[PDB]
Design a protein around this ligand. Sequence first.
Ligand SMILES: CC1CCN(c2ccc(CO)cc2NC(=O)c2ccc(C#N)o2)CC1
Length: 311
Amino acid sequence: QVRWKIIESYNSYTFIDPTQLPYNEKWEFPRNNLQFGKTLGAGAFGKVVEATAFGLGKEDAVLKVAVKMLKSTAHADEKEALMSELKIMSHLGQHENIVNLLGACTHGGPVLVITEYCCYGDLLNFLRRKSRVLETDSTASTRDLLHFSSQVAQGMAFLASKNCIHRDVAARNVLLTNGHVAKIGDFGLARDIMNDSNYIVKGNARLPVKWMAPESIFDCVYTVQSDVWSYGILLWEIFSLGLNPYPGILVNSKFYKLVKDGYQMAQPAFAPKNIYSIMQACWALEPTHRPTFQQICSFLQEQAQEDRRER
Ligand SMILES: CC1CCN(c2ccc(CO)cc2NC(=O)c2ccc(C#N)o2)CC1
C-alpha cells in the first residue's frame, strides 16, 4: 500500500490504533460554510480542492483551506480509507511540518476532509524550476536545501513518535506553504497513481519502488526504518534539484539485484559530503543500522549551525 498507518510498537508506545473504532464527531464542520474553489490536484479515487472556510476553528477566520473528497470511482474500500485517514489525522495531533487536519464534513453529504492549504505547491516542481533557472540568462542556497531537509525530517520525527508510518516519502509528496515551509501529509487519495510511471505494478498494487527500502520491496515489511530509507532518496532528490532517482535505470530484475547488492546512487551535485553521509546512512541495508529521524534532525541542525557560523 501507500497510505499513512499507525503501527504497533512499544520510545513510542501504541496504546490504540485510531483506525479501529468509529470516528470522533469532534471535527465536524458546516458543509455550507465552505465555498469550493480550484482543484489543486486529482487522482483515481478522489481529489483535493482549494476553498474558503468561513468561521473555521475557534478563530472564526476565513482562511484558505484544502478539501479532499472521493469520486464516483470510489467504492467501499475507498470510502474506508478516507475515514481511516481522517481517524489517523484526528489522532496524530498538530505539528508545524504536517498538513494539519482542520475539520471534516461527514454528514448531510459525501465525506469531506478539510486540511491546511499549501500556497506554493509540491517541492519537486519547486526544485525543478530553480534548476532549470540555474542555466541562467530567487536562487536556492545550501541553507535553503537544509531547511527543506530539516522541516521534513521534523515532520517525520513527529510521525515516528506517534508510531505512524508514511510509506510514500518522496519530493512529490512534500508541499510548500507560507515562508516556503515544507509540510507532509497523506496525499494518496488525490494522487493519480494509476497513470504515474513512478508507481510500478506489482500485480495487486502500484508501488513507488525507486523510493522503497529493500525489506519493503522484497519482504513487504514497512516500518519507521523503511521510511528512513525513503527519506534518503528524498534527500537525493532535494540536493540534485529534482532529478529522477536512479537516472536512466529502469525498474526491473537488474534494478532489484542492484539495490539488493548494496548499490547506492552517487552524491548529488549540490550535496555537501556531510549531507551525502546522511543519504548513505539512510541507505544501510540493515534497517537497524539506519539512523532515526531524530538523529537525522539533530545532525541536520549541526550542519545548519556550522553553515551559519560560516555565513
Ligand atoms: C497530490 C497533490 C499534492 C499537492 N497538490 C497541490 C498543488 C498545488 C498547490 C498550490 O496551489 C497546493 C496543493 N495541495 C495542497 O495544498 C494540499 C493540502 C492537502 C492536500 C491533499 N491531498 O493537498 C495537488 C495534489
